[PDB]
Design an enzyme around this catalytic site. Structure first.
Site, PDB file in Angstrom:
ATOM      1  N   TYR D  19       0.810  -1.201   0.000  1.00  0.00           N
ATOM      2  CA  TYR D  19       0.000   0.000   0.000  1.00  0.00           C
ATOM      3  C   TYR D  19       0.847   1.254   0.000  1.00  0.00           C
ATOM      4  O   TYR D  19       0.605   2.178  -0.784  1.00  0.00           O
ATOM      5  CB  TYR D  19      -1.021  -0.037   1.139  1.00  0.00           C
ATOM      6  CG  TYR D  19      -2.031  -1.139   0.917  1.00  0.00           C
ATOM      7  CD1 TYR D  19      -2.874  -1.116  -0.209  1.00  0.00           C
ATOM      8  CD2 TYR D  19      -2.108  -2.241   1.781  1.00  0.00           C
ATOM      9  CE1 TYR D  19      -3.783  -2.138  -0.454  1.00  0.00           C
ATOM     10  CE2 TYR D  19      -3.022  -3.269   1.545  1.00  0.00           C
ATOM     11  CZ  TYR D  19      -3.848  -3.211   0.416  1.00  0.00           C
ATOM     12  OH  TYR D  19      -4.768  -4.195   0.170  1.00  0.00           O
ATOM     13  N   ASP D 104     -18.785  -3.542 -12.961  1.00  0.00           N
ATOM     14  CA  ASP D 104     -17.581  -4.051 -13.548  1.00  0.00           C
ATOM     15  C   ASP D 104     -16.931  -2.931 -14.310  1.00  0.00           C
ATOM     16  O   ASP D 104     -17.609  -2.188 -15.010  1.00  0.00           O
ATOM     17  CB  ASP D 104     -17.875  -5.195 -14.537  1.00  0.00           C
ATOM     18  CG  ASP D 104     -16.617  -6.010 -14.876  1.00  0.00           C
ATOM     19  OD1 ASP D 104     -15.688  -5.503 -15.563  1.00  0.00           O
ATOM     20  OD2 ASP D 104     -16.530  -7.162 -14.405  1.00  0.00           O
ATOM     21  N   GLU D 120      -4.978  -2.876  -8.540  1.00  0.00           N
ATOM     22  CA  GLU D 120      -4.146  -4.044  -8.298  1.00  0.00           C
ATOM     23  C   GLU D 120      -4.974  -5.335  -8.567  1.00  0.00           C
ATOM     24  O   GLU D 120      -5.727  -5.837  -7.722  1.00  0.00           O
ATOM     25  CB  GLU D 120      -3.414  -3.948  -6.939  1.00  0.00           C
ATOM     26  CG  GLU D 120      -3.956  -4.766  -5.787  1.00  0.00           C
ATOM     27  CD  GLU D 120      -3.590  -6.251  -5.854  1.00  0.00           C
ATOM     28  OE1 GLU D 120      -3.417  -6.804  -4.743  1.00  0.00           O
ATOM     29  OE2 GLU D 120      -3.504  -6.869  -6.983  1.00  0.00           O
ATOM     30  N   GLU D 129      -5.200 -13.275 -13.145  1.00  0.00           N
ATOM     31  CA  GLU D 129      -6.471 -12.807 -12.585  1.00  0.00           C
ATOM     32  C   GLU D 129      -7.154 -11.963 -13.632  1.00  0.00           C
ATOM     33  O   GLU D 129      -8.243 -11.465 -13.426  1.00  0.00           O
ATOM     34  CB  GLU D 129      -6.299 -12.053 -11.242  1.00  0.00           C
ATOM     35  CG  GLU D 129      -6.013 -13.023 -10.091  1.00  0.00           C
ATOM     36  CD  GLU D 129      -6.023 -12.407  -8.680  1.00  0.00           C
ATOM     37  OE1 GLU D 129      -6.465 -11.254  -8.495  1.00  0.00           O
ATOM     38  OE2 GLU D 129      -5.586 -13.095  -7.727  1.00  0.00           O
TER      39      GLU D 129
HETATM   40  N1  LIG Z   1     -13.582  -6.178 -13.829  1.00  0.00           N
HETATM   41  C1  LIG Z   1     -13.679  -5.704 -12.568  1.00  0.00           C
HETATM   42  N2  LIG Z   1     -14.487  -4.676 -12.253  1.00  0.00           N
HETATM   43  C2  LIG Z   1     -14.532  -4.172 -10.986  1.00  0.00           C
HETATM   44  N3  LIG Z   1     -13.835  -4.665  -9.938  1.00  0.00           N
HETATM   45  C3  LIG Z   1     -13.003  -5.716 -10.129  1.00  0.00           C
HETATM   46  C4  LIG Z   1     -12.886  -6.302 -11.488  1.00  0.00           C
HETATM   47  N4  LIG Z   1     -12.010  -7.313 -11.408  1.00  0.00           N
HETATM   48  C5  LIG Z   1     -11.599  -7.366 -10.104  1.00  0.00           C
HETATM   49  N5  LIG Z   1     -12.207  -6.440  -9.342  1.00  0.00           N
HETATM   50  C6  LIG Z   1     -11.995  -6.210  -7.911  1.00  0.00           C
HETATM   51  O1  LIG Z   1     -10.616  -5.873  -7.804  1.00  0.00           O
HETATM   52  C7  LIG Z   1     -10.115  -6.168  -6.506  1.00  0.00           C
HETATM   53  C8  LIG Z   1      -8.676  -6.695  -6.613  1.00  0.00           C
HETATM   54  C9  LIG Z   1      -7.981  -6.756  -5.251  1.00  0.00           C
HETATM   55  N6  LIG Z   1      -6.826  -7.610  -5.368  1.00  0.00           N
HETATM   56  C10 LIG Z   1      -7.514  -5.382  -4.763  1.00  0.00           C
HETATM   57  C11 LIG Z   1      -8.509  -4.854  -3.732  1.00  0.00           C
HETATM   58  C12 LIG Z   1      -8.109  -3.600  -2.930  1.00  0.00           C
HETATM   59  N7  LIG Z   1      -7.814  -2.434  -3.742  1.00  0.00           N
HETATM   60  C13 LIG Z   1      -6.931  -3.886  -2.059  1.00  0.00           C
HETATM   61  O2  LIG Z   1      -5.779  -3.737  -2.536  1.00  0.00           O
HETATM   62  O3  LIG Z   1      -7.186  -4.242  -0.883  1.00  0.00           O
HETATM   63  C14 LIG Z   1     -11.152  -7.109  -5.903  1.00  0.00           C
HETATM   64  O4  LIG Z   1     -11.884  -6.438  -4.865  1.00  0.00           O
HETATM   65  C15 LIG Z   1     -12.076  -7.452  -7.071  1.00  0.00           C
HETATM   66  O5  LIG Z   1     -13.413  -7.790  -6.672  1.00  0.00           O
END
Ligand SMILES: Nc1ncnc2c1ncn2[C@@H]1O[C@H](C[C@@H](N)CC[C@H](N)C(=O)O)[C@@H](O)[C@H]1O
Ligand SMILES: O=C(NC[C@H](O)CN1CCc2ccccc2C1)c1cccc(-c2ccccn2)c1
Ligand SMILES: Nc1ncnc2c1ncn2[C@@H]1O[C@H](C[C@@H](N)CC[C@H](N)C(=O)O)[C@@H](O)[C@H]1O
EC number: 2.1.1.320
Lengths: 313, 303, 322, 322
Positions: D19, D104, D120, D129
């Protein structure tokens, strides 16, 4: 349809393969049918260049048994043809020049004949096939004098030297460019810019300096080569697809025409800098032939059935 | 009697050509399903949008004819293992398209070449196709006894043919086929089309193909010698291989132009028929065992 | 989601009824659409969706020089292999009157709107080939007052008894999947050794074009089947009826079956366990049509006289892809 | 394709590095983007894509009052459940500076373009992913000169020896599926009892934004691994590196591993059969990234010193859904 002479078929097959100006100024046309019910080809003479490809306003025409992979003028009335059928064929043009008539059809190759060049004397030719062979022909005798399995994959292009009957270049998908001289007991000499690069796809002798040539590769690069110091002199990324043909202008300081599967024509100077470019074709560009009468006129054919006349600055 | 087939790389009209080769004696035809020269573009404008048809129509034959008479060939310009990305992409798509078309027609078999060491991407695309839909269609790999590079005339001044015998390097061709069928996980759908040359190799490099699933043997016209009366025959050593292949029951494929313009093609074929007639007849055992060859059964437990 | 083989198109092209019924439907519609005094000045734009090897295209042409009316034809087909046949047809015969488009009808950008979209995208249970979704994706290029052919379709179901077919389904168990998947997917079958326990009843209906503000193709239906013998339920037979145009129809419901029409066999929806039924009892079955953006599927259950497992929950055993 | 559980977001939110590395990447970018004399007049529009429970959102805010620059925030998240957390955050705290969008990123219609998309969406093998596909569907609302964070990522592979892990994969055989599927899918694992047979090498790279005329995310790569002990190959370890902004990076390649960063374990790509390797030999492996409109997947093979079956042909054993 205003004309449509005897023996000429009503329709010209869609895939224009070759275009070559005679010295008198008339245009030769090779074409193949590569899709549809019938897989064949036809030969055309157009004394009016501007009239082509219109079957109507042509001087002569004829159906070949199979498609035409390559062709070349033999002197003034002779048409030499690389066939799908495995045959190399000679078509003799009329004394009135209004019929095209089979002179010979010899089934000597084992696969599609892909390439054909006339040797400087004009009495002999070399043909290249997918059967991996190269063959040397006596045109008057209608026979293969010599057969050469020099290569390891299919032959792409054989180019006779402008002035010496026993010399020619071939290149194949086995990565080799062979310089030939039939006077040696071992005729081929492998002379590619010898870092195993991209497969050579097109060849053209310099019309003046009987010892420089150009080769284009499957990657769109054109390269200028000296045979005596073999340190691949110049190269330019001219195309974004394979380079299928290379043609020098009739000028004393010659320009190089270059055609590609990126559907574009280029014209380059002797140091391979781009002078011209044409997107006019919307399918593969198959041949280029410079006018004997007007030296800044250049004609291209494509698989888009376009016969296009270019003005070159 | 033999089952044999003609290989062509040129068919101006499918109706007539088929007639000729039936007339000539052949049980089936190997031909292209698209024009061998008709390179197609899949990604770049304008050529992508080339007006169709892409090939000739299925209506030109009956289903029966397609299922039984036509072995398809991969267009020879298709190179999934090119060094060049763009060619490799077009080849991927081109191969799929040709393969899907054979399946559409219900071809019984379909020929693909192994003419280099590396066929990893060819294998993958095929493996992919094999696991897409449901069909029983066969894939014949056209593999030569002797690699093209090892058959070349010794006529390059500055690249002589490396003369000293190599036990491994005269086997290379088998390893080409080995790896390809290992990567395709021994699919029962993939067999061999062994191509015989003028130079039969060392006896050991033939042995090699013992055990393999040879479904067909390809004889080029070029390797037939001529008898005192101008007709096509085969060397004694070539005749051995034929009898061996006949014992294993494979189909024979005649490829290339006529090199004895004296008679038709049917002379080459007649000669095979001749050799088949001239085997020794089955012994009593071989007659009993006939339908049982390589058929696994549980051993009985009479106890 | 798969490409039909040539021999498949061939077998069904031989149908003696489906095509002339289509011709007729187009012929009636052409008259209703261009009044007599317009016959030479109004040229109707007609789109086949899923042209196949083109027999609907010929049928549209035959309709036009029988109504003496004039049409422009688009022939849209996703099967690149069939598209080969079409393009040889339009070069050798139809000429530029027919434009062949090689794409999905859900994707195609239409140069112009149509008077009439024609299709046959129906399976034995009507909408089991996703004719709703396909025509729903295409309707944005049907003129505001355009006709769909067909206009509507309705599926049907009857309960059946067959120990024979129960066994056939059973015999469909495979390695490497749910030992009871055989029972959670429908079979096309020429039902023969069976008994129909109650008369078929309508299940799912779709109309085209569909001018719903919110379009939903999902469904849930409850049927109640009076049964008047003692027996064992092993399955449900599906059939369908479709309205092509007005009174011109196709049917494989046996009460109203279209004479000679061999193109569709009945569908069978099986159940994991057979269920005893006593004379006088009602069989209550339930069918849902479900979907996401990738696939459509059925789930169903029997809730009387006893319950059964919900079948195919999630399309775990069977989906039809989008 | 699945919705992350609350406790999952919770565990990884505790990362002491990911972060602050992001904060820093945004802080450097903010300075490069608005010159000093513009600091009060230029307000940068910033979009988080996959906001989660919002720690990138706070990080963007912390970046802004450290660069002393001014930002508008969109927080886009597909997980309706996480979206609950976000919306309680924006009511209780962020105020209207942050706009929460629940959709989305491939679907969302953006009211305005962004200066900077932040995300991320990376797994242990970088693009596993589907961060390419997701950011590719979103880039149409990044300003012509917009920055993506991250800017690029690259996956890596090393061959390994481990009888222990070979056994673990083996032990993953299930009923009702291919008895050898365990071997045709990748595992996230904290690799411990193993040996690395050759140094990792780059495999697949993606850059954002992607201004290719024709975008293709498919890939094919050939690696050649010098091996200098005698051993048995049971698998490939994957890692990744990513460039967030300029010189601000994240890594799980052990040569350059980001200190303290526990958020991603290595991935393991197994092989159906172990392969003997003699000192001096080269291991040649091949990896393809494949896709259709519904799903993405890997296939891979070993082609030296001996060949192996092509693994996962078709994504029969494993796909990642779109
Ligand atoms: N196509 C998409 N549209 C919107 N959200 C998405 C999509 N693909 C993945 N995500 C979201 O992206 C996030 C990826 C996480 N690794 C990061 C979450 C957060 N920013 C963190 O770092 O704690 C998850 O919460 C997913 O549900
Ligand atoms: O187990 C098999 N063969 C080994 C047996 O010991 C063959 N003997 C041969 C001696 C003999 C005599 C009387 C009854 C049974 C037998 C079985 C076996 C199993 C399945 C099929 C056959 C079989 C069946 C038909 C033709 C040839 N072989 C043979
Ligand atoms: N979404 C779609 N876009 C284009 N074609 C489709 C689509 N869905 C189905 N098809 C084609 O629709 C046809 C349906 C056939 N039952 C009818 C074929 C043909 N008209 C005949 O009656 O012989 C098949 O050829 C499909 O490949």
């Amino acid at each position: 349809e205003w004309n449509l002479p005897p023996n000429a078929p009503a329709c010209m097959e869609r895939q224009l393969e070759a275009a070559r100006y005679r010295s008198d100024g008339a245009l030769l046309l090779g074409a193949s049918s590569l899709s549809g019910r019938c897989w064949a080809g036809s030969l055309w003479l157009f004394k009016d260049p501007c009239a082509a490809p219109n079957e109507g306003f042509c001087s002569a025409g004829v159906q070949t048994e199979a498609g035409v992979a390559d062709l070349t003028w033999v002197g003034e009335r002779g048409i030499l043809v690389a066939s799908d059928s495995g045959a190399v064929e000679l078509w003799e043009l009329d004394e009135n020049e209004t019929l095209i008539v089979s002179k010979f059809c010899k089934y000597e190759h084992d696969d599609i004949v892909s390439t054909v060049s006339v040797l400087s004397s004009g009495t002999q030719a070399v043909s290249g096939s997918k059967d991996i062979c190269i063959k040397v022909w006596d045109l008057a005798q209608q026979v293969v004098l010599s057969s050469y399995r020099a290569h390891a994959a299919q032959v792409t292009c054989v180019a006779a030297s402008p002035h010496k009957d026993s010399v020619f270049l071939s290149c194949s998908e086995d990565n080799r460019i062979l310089l030939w001289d039939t006077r040696c007991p071992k005729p081929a000499s492998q002379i590619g810019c010898s870092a195993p690069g991209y497969l050579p796809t097109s060849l053209a002798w310099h019309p003046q300096q009987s010892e420089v040539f150009v080769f284009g590769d499957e990657n769109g690069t054109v390269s200028l080569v000296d045979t005596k110091s073999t340190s691949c002199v110049l190269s330019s990324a001219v195309h974004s697809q394979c380079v299928t043909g290379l043609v020098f202008s009739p000028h004393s300081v010659p320009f190089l025409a270059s055609l590609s599967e990126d559907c574009s024509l280029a014209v380059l100077d002797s140091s391979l800098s781009e002078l011209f470019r044409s997107q006019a074709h919307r399918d593969f560009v198959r041949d280029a032939t410079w006018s004997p009468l007007n030296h800044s006129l250049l004609t291209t054919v494509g698989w888009d059935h376009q016969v296009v006349h270019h003005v070159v600055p | 009697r033999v089952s044999s087939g003609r290989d062509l790389n040129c068919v101006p009209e499918i109706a007539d050509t088929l007639g000729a080769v039936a007339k000539q004696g052949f049980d089936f035809l190997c031909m292209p399903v698209f024009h061998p020269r008709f390179k197609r573009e899949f990604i770049q404008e304008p050529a992508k949008n080339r007006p169709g048809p892409q090939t000739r129509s299925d209506l030109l034959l009956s289903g029966r004819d397609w299922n039984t008479l036509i072995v398809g060939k991969l267009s020879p310009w298709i190179r999934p293992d090119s060094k060049v990305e763009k060619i490799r992409r077009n080849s991927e798509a081109a191969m799929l398209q040709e393969l899907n078309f054979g399946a559409y027609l219900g071809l019984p078999a379909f020929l693909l070449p192994l003419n280099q060491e590396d066929n990893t991407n060819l294998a993958r695309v095929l493996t992919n196709h094999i696991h897409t839909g449901h069909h029983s269609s066969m894939f014949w790999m056209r593999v030569p006894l002797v690699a093209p590079e090892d058959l070349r005339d010794d006529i390059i001044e500055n690249a002589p043919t490396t003369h000293t015998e190599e036990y491994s390097g005269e086997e290379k061709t088998w390893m080409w086929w080995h790896n390809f069928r290992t990567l395709c996980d021994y699919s029962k759908r993939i067999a061999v089309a062994l191509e015989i040359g003028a130079d039969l190799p060392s006896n050991h490099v033939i042995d090699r193909w013992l055990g393999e699933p040879i479904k067909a043997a390809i004889l080029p016209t070029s390797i037939f010698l001529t008898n005192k009366k101008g007709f096509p025959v085969l060397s004694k050593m070539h005749q051995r291989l034929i009898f061996r292949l006949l014992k294993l029951e494979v189909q024979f494929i005649i490829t290339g132009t006529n090199h004895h313009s004296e008679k038709e093609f049917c002379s080459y074929l007649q000669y095979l028929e001749y050799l088949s007639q001239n085997r020794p007849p089955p012994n009593a055992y071989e007659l009993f065992a006939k339908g049982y060859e390589d058929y696994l059964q549980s051993p009985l437990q009479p106890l | 989601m798969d490409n039909l083989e040539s021999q498949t198109y061939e077998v069904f092209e031989k149908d003696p009824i489906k095509y002339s019924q289509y011709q007729q439907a187009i012929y009636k519609c052409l008259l209703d659409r261009v009044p007599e005094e317009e016959k030479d000045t109004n040229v109707q734009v007609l789109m086949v969706l899923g042209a196949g090897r083109g027999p609907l295209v010929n049928a549209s042409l035959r309709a036009a020089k029988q109504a003496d009316r004039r049409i422009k034809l688009y022939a849209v087909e996703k099967n690149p292999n069939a598209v080969v046949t079409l393009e040889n047809w339009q070069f050798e015969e139809w000429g530029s009157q027919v434009t062949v488009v090689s794409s999905d009808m859900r994707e195609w950008v239409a140069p112009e709107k149509a008077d009439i979209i024609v299709s046959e995208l129906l399976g034995s249970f009507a909408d089991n080939e996703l004719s709703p979704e396909c025509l729903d994706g295409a309707q944005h290029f049907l003129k505001d007052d355009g006709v769909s052919i067909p206009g509507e379709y309705t599926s049907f179901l009857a309960p059946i008894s067959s120990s024979k077919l129960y066994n056939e389904v059973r015999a469909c168990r495979e390695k490497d999947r749910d030992p009871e998947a055989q029972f959670e997917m429908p079979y096309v079958v020429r039902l023969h050794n069976f008994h129909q326990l109650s008369a078929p009843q309508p299940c799912f209906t779709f109309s085209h074009p569909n001018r719903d503000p919110m379009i939903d193709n999902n469904r849930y239906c409850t049927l109640e089947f009076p049964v008047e013998v003692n027996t064992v339920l092993h399955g449900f037979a599906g059939y369908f009826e479709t309205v092509l145009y007005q009174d011109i129809t196709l049917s494989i419901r046996p009460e109203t079956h279209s004479p000679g029409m061999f193109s569709w066999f009945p569908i069978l929806f099986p159940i994991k366990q057979p269920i005893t039924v006593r004379e006088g009892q009602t069989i209550c079955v339930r069918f849902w049509r479900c979907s996401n953006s990738k696939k459509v599927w059925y789930e169903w259950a029997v809730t009387a006289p006893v319950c059964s497992a919900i079948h195919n929950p999630t399309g775990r055993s069977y989906t039809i892809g989008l």
